[PDB]
Symmetry: C3
Subunit: 314 residues, 3 copies
């Protein structure tokens, strides 16, 4: 599978520093090397150089809107670039606010994509519903066409154009959703599988129904936005907003292996990895190793084993 790696060291979408290091710790663990060994042609586009934003003043309750907005704006352009070069875009970043740029950029080249959002949260608060002002909890609001009129013009996002419909997205792993978010979620009739649905149906059925919903009418590019907090903190503790009772390591690997086999993975986000947020060094390694294993599975790594098309015994 042909890949284009983009590093997004940015953390202004949220209050806990350390997420900007996600790209480095992930590369440090050998992500590019590991992909190569696998069935992959990898190209590194480097880490996006996010410059200073002068009057980066809070817009009402919304914090660092200009920084976050500009950051996503640049990412969007970079992703659009890799999608034009015929490669799957692989974004390694800080907070999830960056999904605004990743998906928007991706939608420019492939406007018919479907989104799979693995997270413990919906990240669908609007600048009007958010109680914290942190943009990593509002990305989805800026991308949905349905909310095109329910969202203020926030400084830094003038370039944004809702690129996806509420029917072109599926959530998996929800377990900490705000009342404001739940209202929108239900109201817009968005497809979701909270941990409740995962418990009831099992991850196999969950994946079956997720893919049926998105690709039923016709095949289309798939964008996987993966927030490492979607998994239980026992596997990914080094992250900003961990919530107990999440996806197990196995379910995380099952989700990606499934997506891989569709042959339609077109964009991937590996977000919220914060190397500074571990209670111990081990917690950091565990989290990084899990993030890597998840990425590798998106690109072919199977638990049953792997091999190319030829004779091994000679």
């Amino acid at each position: 599978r042909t890949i284009g790696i983009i590093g997004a060291p940015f953390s202004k979408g949220q209050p806990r520093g350390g997420v900007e290091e996600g790209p480095t710790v992930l590369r440090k663990a050998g992500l590019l090397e590991k992909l190569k060994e696998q069935e992959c042609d990898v190209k590194d586009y480097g880490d996006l150089p996010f410059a200073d934003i002068p009057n980066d003043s809070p817009f009402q309750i919304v914090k660092n809107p200009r920084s976050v907005g500009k950051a996503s704006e640049q990412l969007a352009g970079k992703v659009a670039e890799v999608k034009k070069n015929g490669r799957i875009s692989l974004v390694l970043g800080g907070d999830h606010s960056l999904a605004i740029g990743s998906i928007s950029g991706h939608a420019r080249v492939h406007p018919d994509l479907g989104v799979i959002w693995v997270d413990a949260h919906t990240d669908i608060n609007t600048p009007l519903t958010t109680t914290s002002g942190n943009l990593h909890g509002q990305p989805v609001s800026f991308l949905l066409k349905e909310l095109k009129g329910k969202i203020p013009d926030v400084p830094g996002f003038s370039w944004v154009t809702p690129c996806i419909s509420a029917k072109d997205i599926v959530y998996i792993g929800l377990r900490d959703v705000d009342p404001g978010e739940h209202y929108i979620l239900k109201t817009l009739g968005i497809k979701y599988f909270s941990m409740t649905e995962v418990d009831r149906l099992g991850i196999g059925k969950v994946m079956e129904e997720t893919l049926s919903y998105l690709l039923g009418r016709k095949k289309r590019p798939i964008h996987l936005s993966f927030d490492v907090d979607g998994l239980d903190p026992s596997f990914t503790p080094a992250t900003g907003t961990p919530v107990v009772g999440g996806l197990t390591y196995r379910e995380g690997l099952y989700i990606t292996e499934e997506i891989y086999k569709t042959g339609l993975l077109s964009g991937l986000d590996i977000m919220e990895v914060n190397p500074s947020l571990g209670k111990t060094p081990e917690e950091v390694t565990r989290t990084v190793n899990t993030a890597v294993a998840i990425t590798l599975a998106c690109f072919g790594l199977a638990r049953e084993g792997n091999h190319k098309p030829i004779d091994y015994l000679n």
Copy 2:
């Protein structure tokens, strides 16, 4: 959902002190506040004042029969009182022996109730089969009509009248059952889902079959007697008789969410929480937080999110 909280600080049904504190640690964690914030009208009936029982002498192998018996007798009256006030009875207690009083009291106002017993044990030993004499392991024996003649008249339980049939109870989570208990269990044809059944069927099917069995012929009030040791000690370690390989946090929350949605929850017991039995302070907090999360789910708290009936965006 309208609630009536009753505190049952009693631990004489078993040998490990500290369970009497269950009510306090649970209230301390903010259980009443949390319920209020939720969709609930809560009323506190306080903690039952269990007085001294003079000749509280062991009846054969049976320990503290008079204390345990009197304790349940008082609880029964209190529960009956809250059920008459049109409220769901919420018992926070010490050992599970108290289920004798909770269910008996509940059955007085709603004789057609069905019981769901989440426990790693059957607690169905009789004063004749028990090898320990501890009453927290025999509650079910005193409540079943089928055993009305297979149980001696124990000092302190003269007031007891078997109120439920073997066909009106379902166990979930069994994994440590005595030979004497298994004989009764099988013999009486009682419906059960041991961890074996949970593994085979999955918690979704388990809940489906549990509810179908109990409410198939007709709807009826549901009593959930929850022994925190039903869950794996990795989630509820601060408890007297922990057994490995139990319900996960997710399965525990799935069980309650399901029961909540039936709209028939009429009585609830949250037992065996022992703040003194943790290997570390954290183990105590973990256990208490889990007990609370379980209770909250019984009364509406959903993992997919919550909100009331109105317009949020204004």
Copy 3:
């Protein structure tokens, strides 16, 4: 169930010392006593006395071939002996290389047996595909008829005769398979349920399909070769090659309970238990206790409870 215990204190199939102690730590934990208390007639054949092998020189990359080979050769004879005495053979050992002797010996008396291999690995490397030379990772290669011509004559295994077909074996729990192994696995059309299959289908369906495949046409003796690393290291950490994301304790007990109920268990291997490989004493106890619980379940121990055919209340 009638049992014949054979101790196999050998570790030359792999590089990490300590596995030879498996038999002792398992007996120390009270395995024989526990089986007796259960529904079992146990007979101890003692620990096979593995003598020194002079020129135990490496055959190419293959290490300790003569030792490993002779060890399995002796085991085979002992197992054949217990199968002739009408008993289920219970092998407690060191590394998995011993499966060569256990299965070969078993096949001599019951040539129609079917094998269930619970492991995180396929242990199917050939002396030609192995990159380490360790025989505990190649047992399956020496037992398969299909590979009768794809395997060199290794010093110490002249006595070996491929006794099982690729269609008479089922793997459960795979998650770390070498490219060379995957090629063979797929090529020979061997039935397997990697953790991927376990995640998708659930352990209940997995067991159903495993047993249907092996006993569909006709009933036949079942041999369970259990590598403790098949389970997740969180339950069996004291083992040589642990891999994350494995079978849970519950799934491990579900697998054995199922096999037990077929009434066809005819041979059992409990391998790779290494008392010296724990990070803490507790990790060693945990691993040993889990190995025991698994064995007990193979012989009748049920989570729902147990009892014999008579009247308990008198």
